[PDB]
Amino acid sequence: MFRQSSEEEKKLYARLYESKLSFYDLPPQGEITLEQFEIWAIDRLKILLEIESCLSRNKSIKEIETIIKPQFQKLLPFNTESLEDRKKDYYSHFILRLCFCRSKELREKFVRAETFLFKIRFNMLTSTDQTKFVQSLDLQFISNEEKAELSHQLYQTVSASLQFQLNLNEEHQRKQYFQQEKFIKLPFENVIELVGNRLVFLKDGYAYLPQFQQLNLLSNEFASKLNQELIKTYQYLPRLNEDDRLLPILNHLSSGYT
Amino acid sequence: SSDMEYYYKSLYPFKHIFNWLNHSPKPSRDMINREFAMAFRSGAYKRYNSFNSVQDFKAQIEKANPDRFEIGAIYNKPPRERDTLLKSELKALEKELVFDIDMDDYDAFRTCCSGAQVCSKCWKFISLAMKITNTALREDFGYKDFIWVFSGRRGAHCWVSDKRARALTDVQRRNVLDYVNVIRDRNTDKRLALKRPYHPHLARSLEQLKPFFVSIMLEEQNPWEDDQHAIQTLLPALYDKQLIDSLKKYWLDNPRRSSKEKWNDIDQIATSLFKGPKQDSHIIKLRECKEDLVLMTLYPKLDVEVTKQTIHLLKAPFCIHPATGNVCVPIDESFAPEKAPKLIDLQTEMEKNNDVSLTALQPFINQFQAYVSSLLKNELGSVKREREDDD
């Protein structure tokens, strides 16, 4: 049969937003303006302020998504090929690190709001994008034999969840889905919020988690790594103090949370 | 006061308790930084004590001579040095995961005794609660290094000392507690909130409690022989209003039928009412109500205040209960409160023999020594596995 046969910064941000979301993993390079610094930080700050306001009003995920999604096209676009939007998103996150690393209360508020925004944007993805994003983060499934041995317990655990979360009211549909579903085994301490609600099966100190759940692990890893990075950011704030032109902006940004 | 002085000087097992709390024969931060609190007959209570060694521990408890002392968390720095620290600088690192069960929580269905009084008839509540809890701790959470302790009058305390259990945060402790807390509302005027089909924990607990429901609830305690108590506790757990009204009317016309008789009346009247194509569904719903009643009556009941915080302080093992005089001994599922030693009896036995090993306290000391030996062996094995994994 027949057969034939700075740019680096732009490539970096294309790579960082191929997954459409990022853990915000890497040091930015090159330059932007100080006006851009202020405006981009304020835009992300407005979205996070509304997220915290809605959470203080005890609104649900669906309501917050209805409130916040129209704001992306104006303040902080998502699911976009534009280099400007990608740089705006990335840089605004990094700026608010330096604003909100300053104290435990600021770190907690910023981690909460940013993790909830992460959850919102992850919900906006297609399942293929979610899979690719999770795989890009280098993030144990059980064997078919172990699934067969624990099938009664796992099905008893997830059958209600399949009906209420995936709308599978028919038991036949639940059985077919369960036959196609994969399960993850990890220590129970890693998914303790699901343990307290008895949403996972426990055996010998390990929790058995279906593949259609477990986004709380992803968002908790995002929150934990962001908290550690903020602690690091706090430790080298004395180097930020070398440019005076940034400190009034950061003081202004933090004043809306104090 | 003199009896307590004699007790600490002659009877309390300081060496075994030190090995348990220190997790090592040689001293460590697990004892040096562990908070202890002492309660006194004057009404005084002193927090933030900690001890450098078994000799220091024994000497300070003997010198203070409290009515009891209580065990708290392991800290980042010695609690006895808190005067050198700001309040924000002294922080907890570990504490044994502890569960607390009280007999008074079963007075919704207990009859032979009420309040802080106890007997072997009702302690079957605590024995089954211990059995279900032990099954959960071993099969679900994989724990092995735990022991039960009699509270001295009316309850039982489980002290879990596995390294992964000791390291749980407050959030993790609250969620573990929620996992094992099934009867989250004690009020009797509703059916349980549990979803169906059962989570495997609930199903296994029900199958473990089913053989004992007749003998304990319907026959031994028999709380529903009183018609008003049945109308107030048994009927609200049922799913249907016509069934409830029919049972209420029938029992008001035919009073003082026993709990077993009422339990059968539920089935008979439901069979009489729910004929036709929907009969299978009604039988299933009735069976669900009875299963939920078994869990409502016999499942473990827990004090959330003991488990929900790492920094909490609780009466230590082998303490003396101030009212009853009982020793707060270690126990197992076959225990009853009538088997506990008392301070006066142990003083008498020591006056006669002058040897602790010949007193009634020594079997309990043997249980605790075996537990400590197993705990230390598992700790050393865990350190070896961690070192091999690091290598």
Curated annotation (Swiss-Prot), chain A:
> Which region ranges are annotated with the description H-T-H-like motif?
169-198
Q: What UniProt keywords are attached to this protein's entry?
A: 4Fe-4S, DNA replication, DNA-binding, Iron, Iron-sulfur, Metal-binding, Primosome
Q: Which domain of life is it from?
A: Eukaryota
Instruction: State one molecular function term (GO).
Output: metal ion binding
Give GO BP annotations, semicolon-separated.
DNA replication; DNA replication initiation; DNA replication, synthesis of primer; double-strand break repair
Would you tell me the Gene Ontology cellular component terms?
alpha DNA polymerase:primase complex; nuclear envelope; nucleus
State the family it belongs to: Belongs to the eukaryotic-type primase large subunit family.
**Described purpose of this protein according to its UniProt entry:** DNA primase is the polymerase that synthesizes small RNA primers for the Okazaki fragments made during discontinuous DNA replication. In a complex with DNA polymerase alpha (DNA polymerase alpha:primase) constitutes a replicative polymerase. Both primase components participate in formation of the active center, but the ATP-binding site is exclusively located on p48.
What is this protein's name?
Answer: DNA primase large subunit
Can you name the source organism?
Answer: Saccharomyces cerevisiae (strain ATCC 204508 / S288c)
The gene behind this protein is PRI2
Swiss-Prot record, chain B:
- Motif Zinc knuckle motif, residue range(s) on this chain: 112-122
Annotated Gene Ontology cellular components are:
alpha DNA polymerase:primase complex; nuclear replication fork
**Top-level division of the source organism's lineage:** Eukaryota
Q: Name the Enzyme Commission number(s) assigned to this protein.
A: 2.7.7.-
The listed outcome for residue 305 to K is:
Cold-sensitive
Record's keyword terms, sorted: ATP-binding, DNA replication, DNA-directed RNA polymerase, Metal-binding, Nucleotide-binding, Nucleotidyltransferase, Primosome, Transcription, Transferase, Zinc
- GO function term, MF aspect, one: DNA-directed RNA polymerase activity
Coiled-coil annotated spans: none
Q: Which GO biological-process labels does this protein carry? A: DNA replication; DNA replication initiation; DNA replication, synthesis of primer
- Broadest EC class assigned to this enzyme: transferase
Q: Where is the active site?
A: 35, 100, 102
Keyword set includes Iron-sulfur: no
Q: How does it assemble?
A: DNA polymerase alpha:primase is a four subunit enzyme complex, which is assembled throughout the cell cycle, and consists of the two DNA polymerase subunits A POL1 and B POL12, and the DNA primase large PRI2 and small PRI1 subunits.
Protein purpose:
DNA primase is the polymerase that synthesizes small RNA primers for the Okazaki fragments made during discontinuous DNA replication. In a complex with DNA polymerase alpha (DNA polymerase alpha:primase) constitutes a replicative polymerase. Both primase components participate in formation of the active center, but the ATP-binding site is exclusively located on p48.
Note from the entry = The bound zinc ion is not a cofactor. It is bound to a zinc knuckle motif that may be involved in sequence recognition and the binding of ssDNA. Present with 197 molecules/cell in log phase SD medium.
| PANTHER family reported in the protein's UniProt record | DNA PRIMASE SMALL SUBUNIT
Which family does the similarity line name?
Answer: Belongs to the eukaryotic-type primase small subunit family.
Q: Could you identify this protein by its name?
A: DNA primase small subunit
Source organism (scientific name): Saccharomyces cerevisiae (strain ATCC 204508 / S288c) (Baker's yeast)
